[PDB]
Amino acid sequence: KLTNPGPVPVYTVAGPSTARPLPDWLLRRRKRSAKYDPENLNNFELIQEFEFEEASNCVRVSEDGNWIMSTGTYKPQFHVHNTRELSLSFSRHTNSENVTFLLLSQDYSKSVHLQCDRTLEFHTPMGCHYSIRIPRFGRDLAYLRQSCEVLVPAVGLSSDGSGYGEVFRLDLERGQFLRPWQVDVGEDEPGSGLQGSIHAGAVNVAAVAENTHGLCAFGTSIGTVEFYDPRSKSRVAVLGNQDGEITALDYSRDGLSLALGTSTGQIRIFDLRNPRPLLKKDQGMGLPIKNLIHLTTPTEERKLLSADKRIIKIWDEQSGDLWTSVEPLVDLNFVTHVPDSGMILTANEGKQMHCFFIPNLGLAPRWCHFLDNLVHEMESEK
């Protein structure tokens, strides 16, 4: 366990030490043949085999909070960790490196992921209910719970009909692809394929709510965020022309305000009715931001920011002041938080999946109680 910042401490309790680690073969050879003096006390892991030896893609904790599903790269697989028993429940291999999954049930008993070789794979604990090829490539994955329907964005322009751009949506009770929700992306070359060209033609992020009204918000590469309403099956809004490709989309706890962000590193907190921004922040460097979620220390509200320049900044919403900043020392591809408090699980490029602990945003979760006492022992050490 380390501590990175001065004023408000974060705690890298599990994580890769070096930006260029050696091959694990050479590491085990030097460990079993050489003499070494490691920090036996403070260095540990908290859940068993929380690594992938190549890279990682996404982490999600269930609404029951007992299961951590995580997908990673070599022999492209997904680990399911039971978090009460602090170990691997299992790990199941797949056909290619996963893009993005969601849990459907409150447990891990139903999963779906959009997967790099243009597939959607539906997973049970029994095995794998069979895959559906989406026609065109995909970027994200969202779930309409009230009318159970998976919706994925697509890059590129459609085959026939209009040339807007498409969001592929299939219901689970009905079973078929209903109709692609048509989102304009822009103009493309008439001379190309049917998968698009290299420069543009991509819808990126789809975001919905699951306790409020739930306006299906999409976001596409010419600086455009769109809004669709369920039970209308048609467009409501087109707004937010920016310079950067929209990579962030997340509602707040109330169900009104939106936190979007662009590929240059600029975030805008919008209201759903005011065209002028409630908040703007131009931070980091020119590497594109990835993921932003709202998180409430039990009284206040604050916001995440995670960007591939190894910058994850927790901003304030009520004042806009930079509350804290973490440097994960590697590329990180996904952030999630334990829904109780405190713990940010981050899927990275490195070997080990790394998780941060904020004592000043919340407490240790209900399955690893002693983390607060370990922070206490580090406070004794300093």
């Binding site: 030896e53 022999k75 056909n95 590129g156 998968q195 698009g196 490029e349």
Partner: protein
């Protein structure tokens, strides 16, 4: 589930067939390695005959051949420019074979001013095609990948020169 057999497909006369036999370990095909840009992440796979092939998943540098003059140097890899097969590899920066990718130019520039001595990109045997000279003034050349990164563990290759250089510039303009 990923395999290499032909028992699932229809015949030459247009007929399907039952022909149910179990998948065997010589019809084995493993999952693809989308080799991307990053620090070195290679996993070693043992294969039939106990033979190792090196599945490289994240790569930084490889040596590239400026071979009309007689050098090859280890240079880094900036970002993939274009790929003849897919657009998603161009989008998500995947290093495959026959990928045109832009690389750094500093060791080639150093070897030019070290061997000949006339500086470049800032008598008669030192001669540079002016398109390639524009690549040197940019400090970022257009290489092409000739080695399989997935099945060797390295992304090496030769630089583009002349007709192929002009062809891939026109294809970038396309």
């Amino acid at each position: 589930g990923i395999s290499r057999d032909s028992r699932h497909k229809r015949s030459h006369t247009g007929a399907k067939r039952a022909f149910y036999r179990k998948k065997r370990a010589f019809e084995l095909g493993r999952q693809p390695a989308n080799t991307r840009i990053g620090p070195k992440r290679i996993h070693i796979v043992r294969t039939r005959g106990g033979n190792h092939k090196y599945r490289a998943l994240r790569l930084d540098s490889g040596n590239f051949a400026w071979g009309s003059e007689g050098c090859t140097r280890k240079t880094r890899i900036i970002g993939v420019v274009y790929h003849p097969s897919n657009n998603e590899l161009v989008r998500t920066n995947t290093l495959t074979k026959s990928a045109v990718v832009q690389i750094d130019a500093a060791p080639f520039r150093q070897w030019y001013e070290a061997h000949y001595g006339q500086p470049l990109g800032r008598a008669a045997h030192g001669k540079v095609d002016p398109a390639l000279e524009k690549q040197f003034e940019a400090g970022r050349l257009y290489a092409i990948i000739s080695s399989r990164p997935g099945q060797s563990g390295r992304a090496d290759g030769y630089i583009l020169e002349g007709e192929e250089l002009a062809f891939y510039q026109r294809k970038l303009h396309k």
